[PDB]
Amino acid sequence: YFQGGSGKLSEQLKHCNGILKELLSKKHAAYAWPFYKPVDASALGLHDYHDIIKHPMDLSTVKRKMENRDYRDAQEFAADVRLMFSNCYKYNPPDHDVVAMARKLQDVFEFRYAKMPD
Amino acid sequence: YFQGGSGKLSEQLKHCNGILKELLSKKHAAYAWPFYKPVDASALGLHDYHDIIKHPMDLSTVKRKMENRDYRDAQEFAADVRLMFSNCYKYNPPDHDVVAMARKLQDVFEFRYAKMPD
Ligand SMILES: CCS(=O)(=O)Nc1ccc(Oc2ccc(F)cc2F)c(-c2cn(C)c(=O)c3cc(-c4cnc[nH]4)oc23)c1
Ligand SMILES: CCS(=O)(=O)Nc1ccc(Oc2ccc(F)cc2F)c(-c2cn(C)c(=O)c3cc(-c4cnc[nH]4)oc23)c1
Ligand SMILES: [K+]
């Protein structure tokens, strides 16, 4: 209900915003879709999720934070994206399909984040 | 020449120290060894390395920083380990052997880092 953030993004944050658009794009939808919204622990029957995962994260939350101008630098953006993957790796056994998807999405993220303009 | 850091590690930093020890252990030496010391750009003939990579990182530097009590929290430790991998992904073509090694080492890192006590 207070004013939302707005302003130009820094050069490094434009790079991050580009990454975000790519992670949300049709290019990666086959493996990105489980990360499009918060994990709905109630609907999926994951009654231990919120006991194991203290800081839930997903791409819709990253998108709202970018649009709101919450991120002040690239490191802060990267930390949220990585948190989203870490949560998946913490909660799930390593042979789960959703873990395979997370690893693929993370390869996309890591390879492009590494090309940060200096 | 001034005093080195010393002090107890927080619980989360003990977890990070444990990860560090594992990354330096014989368990992972077949793919960790290129990260044991800074990239010696002179010796390897990589005369563009320091133009592309602004913040070099390697496991010996992470080790000295942990021993010196440089890291104040787990996120700071993770940022350096991840930076080491990112540098590798930035500099090298994605089919290079050293990239394959980096990905394997990063999988070891990410899966264990995700089990952060909290
Ligand atoms: C769009 C978010 S949502 O509204 O909560 N819907 C949703 C739907 C399916 C999910 O998981 C799967 C994805 C692909 C797959 F092959 C199997 C899944 F269980 C998941 C899912 C996402 N993540 C990030 C997870 O870590 C887990 C774990 C589980 C899970 C379901 N049953 C056991 N574990 O489901 C998800 C989520
Ligand atoms: C222990 C650090 S060191 O003293 O500088 N020695 C060292 C030795 C070999 C290295 O790279 C390779 C490792 C395995 C392999 F199969 C091929 C390599 F080129 C590398 C190496 C490490 N990293 C992190 C890199 O990104 C690259 C890139 C290259 C490289 C060499 N020739 C073209 N690219 O070598 C390294 C380093
Ligand atoms: K990070």
Swiss-Prot record, chains A, B:
Residues 7-116 form the Bromo domain. Changing residue 44 to A: Reduced binding to histone H4 acetylated at 'Lys-12' (H4K12ac). It is found in: Nucleus; Chromosome. Some specific inhibitors of BRD2 that prevent binding to acetylated histone are promising therapeutic molecules for the treatment of cancers or inflammatory diseases. ABBV-744, a small molecule, has been tested on tumors with success: ABBV-744 antiproliferative activity is mainly restricted to cell lines of acute myeloid leukaemia and prostate cancer and is able to displace BRD4 from chromatin. GSK046 (iBET-BD2), which specifically inhibits the second bromo domain, is a promising therapeutic small molecule for the treatment of inflammatory and autoimmune diseases. The first bromo domain specifically recognizes histone H4 acetylated at 'Lys-12' (H4K12ac). It also specifically binds histone H4 acetyl-methylated at 'Lys-5' and 'Lys-12' (H4K5acme and H4K12acme, respectively). The second bromo domain recognizes and binds histone H4 acetylated at 'Lys-5' and 'Lys-12' (H4K5ac and H4K12ac, respectively). Belongs to the BET family. Chromatin reader protein that specifically recognizes and binds histone H4 acetylated at 'Lys-5' and 'Lys-12' (H4K5ac and H4K12ac, respectively), thereby controlling gene expression and remodeling chromatin structures. Recruits transcription factors and coactivators to target gene sites, and activates RNA polymerase II machinery for transcriptional elongation. Homodimer. Interacts with E2F1. Interacts with (acetylated) STAT3; promoting STAT3 recruitment to chromatin. Interacts with CTCF; promoting BRD2 recruitment to chromatin. This is Bromodomain-containing protein 2. The gene is BRD2. The chain holds residues 344 to 455 of 801 of the full protein.
